[PDB]
Amino acid sequence: DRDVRILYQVGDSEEDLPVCAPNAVCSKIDLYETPWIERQCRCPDGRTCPSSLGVEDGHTIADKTRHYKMCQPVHKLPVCKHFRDYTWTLTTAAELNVTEQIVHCRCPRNSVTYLTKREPIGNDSPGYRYLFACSPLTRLRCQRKQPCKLFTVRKRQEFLDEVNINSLCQCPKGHRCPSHHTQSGVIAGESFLEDNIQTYSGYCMAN
Amino acid sequence: PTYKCPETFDAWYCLNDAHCFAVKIADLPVYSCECAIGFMGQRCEYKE
Ligand SMILES: [Br-]
Ligand SMILES: [Br-]
Ligand SMILES: [Br-]
Ligand SMILES: [Br-]
Ligand SMILES: [Br-]
Ligand SMILES: [Br-]
Ligand SMILES: [Br-]
Ligand SMILES: [Br-]
């Protein structure tokens, strides 16, 4: 069986986690390489955060290489309108080293989420709330010699990375865009922010 | 607390002369494109 690691957004055990707010993502599952789970919060009211790696439990929202697990079934959430609706928001409590992701709607199929706006959290709390919207997948065709996908790879442990992918364009027919930063057609970019965050660019390769 | 994007992001990510930038939310940068007036979407690819 694969080494599916269980990590915690804060501390190292269930007991160290906050209780989930309504509609908070309770776990994030990363499916870029070997699946792993990062626990965010503990579900209230006797429920338990779902831990399966697929979407067939009915508590899952998929986006790019991640699955977001919710305490309650996702069919209860409305479908977002592209651009206008915020699928989710992010806030951080800096003193608690805790992030909260509140989900408002599900993006349509063939969508990508993106950071779109910010607003103050409110009168009594410090900082900003970040608002994410849904955009349709790009129909863009790659220019010759331009990258088709960007990777940002954070080495969390020596054998566990947290990775964000950004697709840029569709390769010509008969060509493939690399889907992992170790495939052929990938060039290392630069360190970014920290020594353990590395960017890569993938290019269209014949076949 | 916003950051300048890495070179390849700066060069290729944001379309239609939008501005690339990163926000550090939870140890990972989140990239975003600040759209020039008249555009919308993840990479500011769409006209409003
Ligand atoms: Br709940
Ligand atoms: Br739980
Ligand atoms: Br499973
Ligand atoms: Br499932
Ligand atoms: Br928006
Ligand atoms: Br390969
Ligand atoms: Br290389
Ligand atoms: Br991003």
Side-chain angles (χ1 to χ4, degrees), chain A:
Chain A
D1 285 45
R2 299 182 292 180
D3 185 27
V4 177
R5 295 182 193 186
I6 306 307
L7 283 82
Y8 290 86
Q9 80 154 310
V10 70
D12 62 28
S13 64
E14 290 294 314
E15 293 66 41
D16 292 333
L17 297 169
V19 176
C20 302
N23 305 310
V25 170
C26 61
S27 285
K28 283 194 267 205
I29 304 177
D30 185 311
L31 298 176
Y32 173 78
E33 195 180 290
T34 302
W36 58 282
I37 300 170
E38 192 189 53
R39 300 279 297 105
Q40 309 300 299
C41 54
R42 288 177 286 111
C43 292
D45 299 318
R47 297 196 193 79
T48 301
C49 190
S51 84
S52 56
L53 304 178
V55 309
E56 288 302 301
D57 68 8
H59 281 64
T60 304
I61 292 163
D63 182 49
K64 309 206 260 68
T65 52
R66 289 200 172 74
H67 285 170
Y68 299 96
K69 312 302 289 200
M70 311 304 294
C71 294
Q72 287 185 48
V74 300
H75 75 258
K76 303 176 159 296
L77 295 162
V79 180
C80 307
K81 272 111 172 192
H82 283 139
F83 317 119
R84 301 177 169 191
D85 291 336
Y86 314 112
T87 178
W88 66 67
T89 63
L90 283 179
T91 59
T92 293
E95 205 66 34
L96 308 175
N97 282 356
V98 162
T99 290
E100 176 169 277
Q101 183 173 348
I102 297 302
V103 174
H104 295 277
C105 60
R106 301 174 276 118
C107 294
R109 277 206 166 114
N110 310 331
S111 281
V112 66
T113 59
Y114 67 99
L115 175 59
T116 192
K117 289 186 152 73
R118 70 178 185 176
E119 56 182 17
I121 292 173
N123 294 172
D124 299 341
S125 310
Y128 288 111
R129 180 183 292 107
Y130 298 92
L131 273 46
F132 291 72
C134 308
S135 196
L137 299 173
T138 67
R139 258 106 181 180
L140 287 177
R141 294 307 199 86
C142 299
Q143 190 77 32
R144 58 161 280 158
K145 294 196 301 173
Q146 87 150 277
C148 56
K149 179 166 275 182
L150 306 175
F151 307 80
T152 303
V153 179
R154 177 181 189 251
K155 194 171 290 279
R156 188 166 174 145
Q157 296 291 340
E158 298 299 335
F159 291 77
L160 193 158
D161 302 317
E162 195 170 354
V163 179
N164 282 341
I165 65 159
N166 294 96
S167 179
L168 304 187
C169 55
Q170 306 210 338
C171 286
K173 299 290 178 178
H175 291 66
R176 58 155 260 277
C177 191
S179 60
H180 188 271
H181 69 286
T182 63
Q183 286 173 0
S184 301
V186 182
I187 300 168
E190 45 267 303
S191 269
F192 182 55
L193 278 40
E194 301 288 339
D195 268 34
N196 73 325
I197 296 153
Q198 171 68 44
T199 65
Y200 300 80
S201 295
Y203 293 83
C204 296
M205 297 291 281
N207 309 347

